[PDB]
């Protein structure tokens, strides 16, 4: 603890999202959790919900409806869809808000109702929200009040593709993406599908053709391309808790080589602490960024002429979620972006 | 009637699988097993899970007596295979699980393996052991080159679709995933539980030794040179393999059309099943069986389709198919000793 | 399929137990499933409940009420607890029944109600039921109509301990047992505690002093000792799907050595196909019996004078459950015990 | 970083031990690695050996013989064995040294030879070395130049047992211990037995009667009891990377209850940040201390009258190794004990 303390409120902290925010803020010198909510577990001690955090001095969980924000400086929000928009819309003006849900991610409010089953409840506010892909919208994020924190898959995919598309080094046709993620992305909910026995020692694709993150990914790619981009995105559930890898099979622009893609990503992220372009032909392993806020990537040439292969990995729970959220709040509060986010990966 | 089996190079996982599968085979009985590093040792000592099996002690390959052997399963190094197999007696059914006799173009072999083919004559008579596809040929063959795991999972769905001209041979993008058991039992830092568990990574980028084997099969089906994109990934699981093929369909063809053609092609096949509706094949669902489960889906991009195929890399992807082939070449039903259902959970 | 088919009925087949029975019987040349029941999953196709069995020609699930036993030879039962006692009590007479639940394992009626919450609903029937520990009560089981198939932990423990106690080679004082089991024993029920994320890469003890298998184990040991035996049993949930290991720390009788124990178990089980004493100082691995109906064991000298350490492993789902259930039905039907049970361990 | 820099040298850093030290020191404001040795991988960048540490600014590994200690203040040592004593003996008589090997853990030189074959090579230095069980020998560690960092199993075992024995609350007879550990404790050595395929989905006991940690454990227990303590210790290799759990089945002294044991541990470690006694009957999970320098423990009454069950868990790589080493060096350098050791558990 140092500098001036920033009073934090975590809304919807009973999931893994909340556990990670707590974990990360325990290492942050200024951010201090003062209020935590979990409607289904109000009155309970967080240490009772997450035994691994028993040594942390935290306030008892309260129902979000009883949360007092008058003496709070910033909020990390992780509530259900629809309810999020209503709650955030009512929060006081003097606050920094980072919503980890997808509720304020899509600019097209109609595109939201189509993919989430209901009318956008905060259309006015949606126009004020800024997409939290730190390294890409940094300028806009630092003077934004409401930040819509990106989803995990979208984060791993846009970091490499956005800059390449803006520079016109790759075409926007036939972008084939095969993404893999640890099962922690499915949450703590009691589901037969996510049982150790149903997951361990095996894998399988899911969300074929229409995963809810597709619109989010295309939104960012379309803005970079200045034309409607339609991708092929196939996620796969892996028998591991943490870690995410997105492999993008792209067609390069006329005369462009895999090395050209490599050099552009290199100069684009050379000064970026959390986005690292690996050396030579080193292959990024998801195991090498677990527990860190890092994104490791590299690009290789495809056996097929004119094509390239891009591999991007992150800890779906950190840079893919809570890590990026804290990174954004650091930026919004004017603090170094790496504050409390320098934990090196836990390997083995 | 009992068929005397010899297993050359049985100290690996491949050998263990052969022993396990032949344990429930009414006719095939192992009489000879070789291994040079672990020669003289009891197999139950190399693989404690097979301690109840009555097997001969391992012997050096140079001391193996094939005179009283009917069939042979071969699993030797990247070069010693051609020499050894070339010197085996004539009256024998031979199923080589290595990749030494998989490529017909003797030239392509030198390219991807360094040295020149050491048995070009035999190469001409060897038959690619992709059972469901070359059944007729395998039945008449003396020497069968058992397919590799990735190639098996891929050619089964792709060969018939290309022959029927329902998919194009351009931009065939393949992302394959395999359990680390495919890496072998060799002592390596990279394959340690600590270096593998709770994580994944791609490997053999652009230049994996199975690429020409895959293209060979696709090219003949297409009658033109096919160049694919193939990217394998090492998964943190022991058994299981899943190949995802992102293909472009011919004009006017839909994903369902591909589904129906595969359905018709394999309706009578016991070990290749097309799942119903849009059910997704899980590698966990075929572990320990000689099955290959597959299904095809519409791609979000117009004119494209997504094909998913899974097998147990150690069974239908290796030893299972080798036994399926030997049954065929020995005149026995193909499923003999290969009806074990998947071990799930 | 060989001469003389036996029509099998499986009640409560929607769980892992049922799945294992299906897998095993597909290997059985005589046993053929003709009826399968599921409570809140009736009418569905078994291949839909368990995709890995999609190739098996099986009857669709029906309500237990619709079960027609007129043409059924044997019955495998796996139900709630309390529901089992009722259903079995009301079953035909000319039926061979193997109950995998714990309902008919304990002879002490009060002891049951005391460990299962409710009172025994078939006290009269309980007296006819035979404990299904094959190798130990083979003669009784053979002529029994109702067989109470043993639990997994109890199977791994009694096999080595019962003969040793009968032989008076070990004392019944301070029998300390630390058992470890794969999470598959917890069932396919949707529960947070059994999620991959909550189980993977970690272990923990459970049921500390108060596990339902204790009275089952003590019952067998007390009978073998002709005295009331009170043990120390502590189970541990391991991050693996199947496999089970029981480590018994016992005190040997005066003048007895670990080798003496070893030789008695060897002679006791030399002609037993499914109970094997490993050679020399070989340590039994759970990974080495997975998928088989084997129980591998060995006994070692303890550093403390006068003590020994016995290690016993089995696949909790096979010899610890469905495999032994099938072993028992074979015996009851006059078929070789290994019929459909010669599957060698799936390793790796 | 802040407050005068402490230049660190790590001898034998190519293993998990060294990687862990690097990870922990990256979070330490004062400790800065300046020298790292390794013979096999001499000349290589640490980031090439451990890809998860590529963003760290470290010196290339150098052969120990070419190591320069002129600009080093303290040293962490993780050399083979039989090599440690000779090397440490030759280091500058002014460096603070924490040896993570077992070579200086045994005070009785005769015991060392009697257990390792060859004689102790630095018996004179041995008398000077201090056993590094921080919470137990804090005062001595503060003043030591050479600290023999405890092994993992012994640390998890002595923390609970030592206090209880000194208070004579438990007998020193029939102390039965069954311990479990993640395979990371086996090292990064290329070995068939530690392959994913040979470890995953299975467990097995090892070192039956004869594990090298036994004399270390008995040394601590005998000191506490003031008599020779002979224990029963049985380790087990678990299919998980990190984590360790020791379960001690002990006999309580006359009139002593489990609660008495609980209350004494509660009182003993009340002010200890890294040794936590859980509440009520809360069971410690190894998954709940992963990545942290914590030891979670609890005690329960055994089903057998007069007996009790103690469970202690830690991350074998942190509190069981590098975490405690850093903890000790903090004391020796006069820095707050928890400096750079406040990382909360990585769960899930």
From Swiss-Prot, chains A, C, D:
Catalytic activity: N-acetyl-L-glutamate 5-semialdehyde + phosphate + NADP(+) = N-acetyl-L-glutamyl 5-phosphate + NADPH + H(+)
Localization (cell): Plastid, Chloroplast
Keyword Iron-sulfur: no
Residues at the active site: 152
One GO-annotated biological process of the protein: L-arginine biosynthetic process
Superkingdom: Eukaryota
Subunit details: Homotetramer.
Protein name: Probable N-acetyl-gamma-glutamyl-phosphate reductase, chloroplastic
Native organism: Oryza sativa subsp. japonica (Rice)
Lineage of the species this protein comes from: Eukaryota, Viridiplantae, Streptophyta, Embryophyta, Tracheophyta
């Amino acid at each position: 603890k140092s500098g001036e303390e920033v009073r934090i409120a975590v809304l919807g902290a009973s999931g893994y999202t909340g556990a990670e925010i707590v974990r990360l803020l325990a290492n942050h010198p200024q951010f201090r959790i003062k209020v935590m909510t979990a409607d289904r577990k109000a009155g309970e001690q967080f240490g009772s919900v997450f035994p691994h955090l028993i040594t942390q001095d935290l306030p008892n969980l309260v129902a979000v409806k009883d949360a007092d924000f008058s003496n709070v400086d910033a909020v990390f929000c992780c509530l259900p869809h629809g309810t999020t928009q209503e709650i955030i819309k009512g929060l006081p003006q003097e606050l920094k808000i980072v919503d980890l849900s997808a509720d304020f991610r899509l600019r097209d409010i109609n595109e939201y109702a189509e993919w989430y089953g209901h009318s956008h409840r905060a259309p006015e506010l949606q126009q004020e929200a800024v997409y939290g892909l730190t390294e890409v919208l940094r300028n806009e994020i630092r003077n934004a009040r409401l930040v819509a924190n990106p989803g995990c898959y979208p984060t791993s995919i846009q970091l490499p593709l956005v800059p390449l598309i803006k520079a016109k080094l790759i075409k926007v046709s036939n972008i084939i993406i095969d993404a893999k993620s640890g099962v922690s992305g499915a949450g703590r909910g009691a589901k037969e599908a996510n049982l150790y026995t149903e997951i361990a020692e095996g894998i399988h694709a899911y969300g074929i053709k229409g995963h809810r993150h597709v619109p989010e990914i295309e939104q960012g790619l379309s803005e970079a391309a200045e034309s409607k981009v339609t991708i092929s995105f196939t996620p796969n559930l892996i028998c591991m808790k943490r870690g995410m890898q997105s492999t993008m099979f792209v067609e390069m622009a006329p005369g462009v080589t895999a090395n050209d893609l490599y050099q552009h990503l290199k100069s684009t992220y050379e000064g970026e602490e959390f986005v690292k372009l690996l050396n030579g032909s080193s292959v990024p392993h998801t195991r090498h960024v677990v527990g860190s806020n890092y994104c490791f990537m590299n690009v290789f040439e495809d056996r097929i002429p004119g094509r390239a292969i891009i591999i991007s990995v992150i800890d779906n729970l950190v840079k893919g979620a809570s890590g990026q959220a804290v990174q954004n709040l650091n930026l919004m509060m004017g603090l170094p972006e790496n504050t409390g986010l320098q934990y090196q990966p836990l390997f083995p």
